[PDB]
Amino acid sequence: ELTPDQQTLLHFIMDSYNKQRMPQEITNKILKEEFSAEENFLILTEMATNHVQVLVEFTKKLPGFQTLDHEDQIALLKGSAVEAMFLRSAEIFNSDLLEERIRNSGISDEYITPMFSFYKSIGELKMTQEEYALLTAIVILSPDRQYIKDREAVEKLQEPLLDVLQKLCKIHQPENPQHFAELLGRLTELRTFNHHHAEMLMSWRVNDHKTPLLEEIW
């Protein structure tokens, strides 16, 4: 069912979605480091710091994103970043040590409980990598973010991706005509989450340089 052009759109979304790569140093810390509230927080925030970078990269490569007005590009990424990070974080769980660090990191259950139920609801959907990648592009190119001067130009970028995802939900899950709707339902659900804690964190950058002090590069 995909067209050649639909195949190519999908191809370039997958290459840029892959190429995401979490340094082994970060993933090794999860098992090996001390478990204490401060170390746990610094490890989760270092991972999230890697995710923001990957997210911003992925956004800049999205098909047509660079064609948009520069002030609207800023506003689109500002509006979408929290929900896109939430979606990313789910992929990381779907790790038993990672959860125990999250549950003793000083972060309030106010924010941990909704996220963990969200992860379960995502695992139930049996999402392919192709489906994560498309849904991430879709949440990012949302034409209704605040502060967008030209909503129709963002609609033009989003709509081809919505078409491709819908065709993929038909092919891969013919017995479930409600698969596509249920994917979009997860994005609807993220918009209802409390974004305030994530917005407070979104500008912070945490990196472990545990290289001799004397040889460190600033």
Q: Which residues bind a second copy (CB under 8 A)?
A: 34, 36-39, 41-42, 45, 52-53, 56, 59-60, 73-74, 77-78, 81, 106-107, 200-210, 212-216, 218
* 132 labelled binding-site residue: no
Window 122-181: residues binding ligand XX9 (CB under 6 A)? none
Instruction: State the binding partner of 59 from a second copy, ligand XX9, none, CB within 5 to 8 A by kind.
Output: a second copy
CB 47, min distance to ligand XX9, A: 4
* 191 labelled binding-site residue: no
Instruction: State the binding partner of 40 from ligand XX9, a second copy, none, CB within 5 to 8 A by kind.
Output: none
* 119 labelled binding-site residue: yes
d(C-alpha 134, C-alpha 118), whole Å: 18
Identify whether the C-beta of residue 8 lies closer than 8 Å to the C-beta of residue 128.
Answer: no
- Report helix angle 151-172 to 4-17, nearest 10: 100
Helix (H) or strand (E) holding 168: helix 151-172
Instruction: State the binding partner of 86 from a second copy, ligand XX9, none, CB within 5 to 8 A by kind.
Output: ligand XX9
Helix (H) or strand (E) holding 138: helix 129-140
Instruction: State the binding partner of 36 from a second copy, ligand XX9, none, CB within 5 to 8 A by kind.
Output: a second copy
Identify whether the C-beta of residue 142 lies closer than 8 Å to the C-beta of residue 158.
Answer: yes
Q: What is the CA radius of gyration of the chain?
A: 18
Identify whether the C-beta of residue 39 lies closer than 8 Å to the C-beta of residue 97.
Answer: no
d(C-alpha 131, C-alpha 88), whole Å: 12
Instruction: State the binding partner of 41 from ligand XX9, a second copy, none, CB within 5 to 8 A by kind.
Output: a second copy
Q: Which residues of 107-122 are buried (b: 16+ CB within 10 A; e: fewer)?
A: beeeeeebbbebbeeb
- Among 52, 127, 134, 138, indicate the residue that binds ligand XX9 (CB under 6 A): 52
- Among 86, 127, 134, 137, indicate the residue that binds ligand XX9 (CB under 6 A): 86
Identify whether the C-beta of residue 209 lies closer than 8 Å to the C-beta of residue 216.
Answer: yes
Nearer Cβ to ligand XX9 (6/27): 27
User: Which one of the spans 25-33, 41-49, 127-135, 184-192 is the region binding ligand XX9 (CB under 6 A)?
Assistant: 41-49
Known binding-site residues for chenodeoxycholate equal: 88, 111, 119, 197
